Amino acid sequence: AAPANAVTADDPTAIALKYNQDATKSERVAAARPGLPPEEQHCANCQFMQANVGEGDWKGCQLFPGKLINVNGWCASWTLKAG
């Protein structure tokens, strides 16, 4: 079950970025964002995931202030975690 502050499918920014809590139900292949092949991309390996926010599988994303994403999710702002 998601947390009360989870990013949801109805959030305008989530819609614009094509976020899904489950990267296997995402359009990562169509987007072909650079840095890894698309099937390898999800929030856990994204530069914007905040590992010190949230708990368990539900972590922060810098782009979604006050909310939580799932580490197994994806959106079109996916960017390789480089530091």
Binding site residue list for [4Fe-4S] cluster: 43, 46, 61, 75
For the bound state, the minimum distance from the C-beta of residue 22 to ligand SF4, rounded and expressed in Å, comes to: 12
The shares of helix, strand and coil residues in the chain, as percent rounded to the nearest 5, are: 25, 25, 55
Among 46, 54, 58, 67, binds ligand SF4 (CB under 6 A): 46
48 binds ligand SF4 (CB under 6 A): yes
Are 76 and 26 in contact by the 8 Å Cβ rule? The answer is: no
Closest CA to 56 of 71, 42, 67: 71
Binding site for ligand SF4 (CB under 6 A): 19, 43, 46, 48-49, 61, 63, 69, 73-75, 77-78
